[model samples]
Target: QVLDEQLAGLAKAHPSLTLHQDPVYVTRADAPVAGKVALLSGGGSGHEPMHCGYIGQGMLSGACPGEIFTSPTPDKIFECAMQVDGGEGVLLIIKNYTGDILNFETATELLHDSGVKVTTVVIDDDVAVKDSLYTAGRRGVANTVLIEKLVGAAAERGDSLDACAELGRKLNNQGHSIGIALGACLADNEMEFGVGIHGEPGIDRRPFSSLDNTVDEMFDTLLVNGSYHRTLRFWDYQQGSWQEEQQTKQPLQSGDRVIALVNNLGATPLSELYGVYNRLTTRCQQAGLTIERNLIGAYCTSLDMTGFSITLLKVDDETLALWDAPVHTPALNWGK
Candidate 1:
């Protein structure tokens, strides 16, 4: 209901965008055209102006926003994949979550069997609950927006499926995220370090001292990548058990350059966001990491939750050019 209504406004306002019902999805009206590969990305809803807000010129070619905080079904994924699959192929930039992983993987297999060339990359940037590997494993929070922007640019210029997939994974490995909460978190541990984007608890329980302390803590977590174990997934319809591969998170070291995102949850004030970015700049500079580009706003937000998350993605010249490329999405719009 809400998803369809939001789509109403988006498609109505954006001349280049289109929406579908019955089996839901949103896409570019001019997509599936020759020469260019299409970029499709989405997950549960409630992260508005997200995958849907991103469907337009210079951004995602298509998106399948599932129910609020719920993953979309395979049918929706396949339908959207079919619509956006330009002659070249389609690239799916998925968020790392159980529902999303399975559904998208299933859709990928279906697309492949049906003869629609497809490639998928998962983004699991949230370094929150690495301790509670049993729970909501490293939630794919914010950096997803960044990935969509970069990958979309490459697709527009006719980058192949393999090229887009490679770049997407590179960005995923280069980025790390941390979140903060006022009260407490579930799946308890030492530092109160975990935070779920969907109104879930964090890992540690630290004393809420000052804004300075909170911001620094989040910054430090994003900067340091301690040992992390993850049960990742890939598709093989012929296999018996799901292929779950284990992977590790690498740490952020000195002399590294990055793109930072200062995101807000619920209804944080712009004044506070500014303060976070201010303190954040100091930390990055003091820590010896160069800030090539940055985005500060209320992105990847949980409903009415008052908190913030920081994401740092290592970047280079080509990455910068892709980031600088023009993108005219709903929430974020500006470029060449």
Candidate 2:
């Protein structure tokens, strides 16, 4: 009941968004643009401005928001897909949580049976763990914000559904994120290291130290766990069946170009985020990484939890160009 009221208030505040009832999904207010591969994504809500805050031009065409911190139902996912489908087709950017994958995959099949062109890419960028209570493998977290913007820009530039899916898959594989928590507002002398967004306990509880020490450990952890291999599934439109592929994440090496995102989980002040960026800039330079672009703010959050996450997404010429493309959304907007 409270979640419904919050979503309705969001739509009311943002004229570009339209709130749909029953299952409760939100979409861009305007009709689907002809021939564009409509972008769609969603998950549990407590993350705020994530799947919902991202609905607008150069981002998501529609976002299916579930009850706070719970995955949206298959019906909600299917309805959003139907609402966002342009003549070109639709692309679903799914985070690699168990519930999200199950529901989104079911909706993908439903869309297929309904004769709508659709495809999907799953994000598992959280480098903190291999498997968790809520995920089959690594949990998808902050890097999701980056993938949505890059892939959405591609779609806005007239990329086909296949093309957009390909871009999203590439970005997911190239990007990685790790978070740290000071506490659930716990003791003043300790911090939770390698934490996730769901308010769960982190892998390690270590002595609290200066900002530089914390950022140092986070950066080291991110670079050391540089490679992961996973099987990913994509819908084959021609064969009308699911196809699996083994994909590996390439390590971030010296002299690589990257887009850095410093995201606030929740309750962290902007003044402190800049301090993170300050240290992160030095770390990247020391490691010979070129920061092509950066986004620092609360793109994805775990409600009022106090912590932050850093994402490093390696990019090349093509991906960097797409990153530079225009994007307009409630949470992120740039370049008209």
Candidate 3:
């Protein structure tokens, strides 16, 4: 594909720029500032605006994109690090893939040799790929966005690179995602489970079913890990603390704040994401949880994979405020 070539041309058109043959774009970290933590994220191609689009002030310092269904080279990731490393350090937000993990790991070691501090967090939220012949483990999917947002906020709040990395890990620990293809994926009349982002065969295959049934199955599967219970309990604890924290600042009730995210994988429409969000919100409310902030969009996606994933980030008031802060980038620009 001409994906890499196109990005190279775009970078050439803009000097003081760097672009790899893979579909990733780079933006250097501006100026030097101590105590500032830089963020980086990457995945295979087709998940546009993911690693690259989110690079800017208050977001990722750099993003490395790999080829479709492939991983980016170690050299490319190293280049991104060289460009984005401000004086503090660089944190890599990598999805769970053999190649990605290896490449990022190699890049980390290489950077470390050059005296550049680098850390990595791998996202593995997909319930599918329990045991796949090709995959090293569960393929990382949409939860990467939630992790990045929350971790980015932590970094913006003056948290150290290690602290921000810990926060990302905490979010990953509390989060879980499961998805079901309504109909055949990338083809007519042929649906499969345990599929990768590139339309690889999933765990199983069956005829299409009603949306409700599909959602029910997904929720049921998620319950298997007890993540639902953990999520509910986590929300309860945060709400309790939030009540105390907010009361110290001003008068507030116990049920005043919450945050949520519903992201669409590529090929899924915005309307559908809203539909899923509506149901998810109702369920959370019924469970006695208050959603103070909600985000829905194609924040993370497969290459035109006609599916979406849901992510819930249990946050307190501090995190909520940071979430509302302005972020300027190609994919997500707000409060600018």
Candidate 4:
């Protein structure tokens, strides 16, 4: 019900976005870009202005919105891919969840079998839990927004499907995120530390305190768990099969440049998020991590939960340049 209303509003307000109802996906109204790789990303609804809100000139070409907190089906994903593919091929930016992985993988194979070049990158940036109720590995949280922006810019500039996939994978490796709930959607003075995006229970619960303390603990956890290794699967375009490779997160270090995101889970006020950025910047400086760019607001959310998450994507000249590239999306618009 909420998803339907939001999509209707988005289509009405954004002339470029066209809402579809058959398989229920949203896409750009304009014809697919010539010689550009089509970018597609999707997940459960309720994370408003996310996969849907991000469809536009410099981001996704299409987005599938599933039921609230549920993964979109493979048919929806396949149709969106067909709508966006522009001869260069299509790239799917997926989060690491049990349903999402299985569904997106099915769609990827289907697209490939249909003679469309397709590939995927699974994002698992959350450092809170190794596995959760909804995911086999770490939950892909706020950092997905960052990945989409960076990779979207690459695709917008005509990066090949392989190039886009590589860029997305690198950004996922360089990024890390951790969430904290002062008051949860479902709390009191106690905080849920290492919370998942779906309102799942946190790994631990700690006494709620001031903003600085929470930021400190969150940042510390990020650094401590930053260096992670996991096996990730990618489509072997040349081989026409799937291949598994070991991927590791680039640990943050003193003097490392980063793009920091202080994100609202759901119900966090914008003013409070700024306060989070304040302490977060200080923490970055104290730890010798340099924050080159910052985004503070609701990029990814948890459906009206009163808390936030911090994401640090280690950046370089290329990454920073792409981050600054022009983007014209509903939720995120800049450099245009």
lDDT of 4 by residue, 1-336 (tens): 766887788889989888888888989887476789999999998787678888888889999989988999999999999998899989998999999999999999999999999989999999889879988888998899999999999999888888899999999998999998866563468899999888877879888788889999999989988888889998886788999999988678898999999999888889889998999988899999999999998899878878999999999999998999999888999983
lDDT of 3 by residue, 270-290 (tens): 877777777776666655557
Q: Predicted candidate 4: what Cα RMSD to the true structure? A: 1.2
Off by over 4 Å in 4: none
Q: Each candidate's lDDT (Cα)?
A: 0.77, 0.88, 0.63, 0.89
Candidate 1 residue lDDT tens string, 56-167: 7677888998888888998999999898777787888878777888888888888878878777777788877752332346778788888888888888777887788778
Q: By TM-score, is 1 or 2 better?
A: 2
Write the residue-wise lDDT of candidate 2 on 1-336 in tens digits. 788679879988999988988767889898477789999999988898897899888889999988778899999999988988897989999998889999999999999999999899999998888777788878899899999999989999998888899889989999988998886627677888888777656678898688888899999988998789989888887788899989999778898899999999898999999999999999999999999899999899998788899999999999888888888889988894
After aligning candidate 1 to the native by TM-score, how far in Å is the CA of 290 from where it should be?
0.7
RMSD of 3: 8.3
Off by over 4 Å in 2: 185-187
Predictions: Cα RMSD each: 3.5, 1.3, 8.3, 1.2
Rank all candidate structures by their TM-score, best first, as comma-separated numbers: 4, 2, 1, 3
User: On lDDT, who's better, 2 or 3?
Assistant: 2
Q: Any runs in candidate 1 off by more than 4 Å, and if so which?
A: 131-137, 183-193, 226-231, 234-249
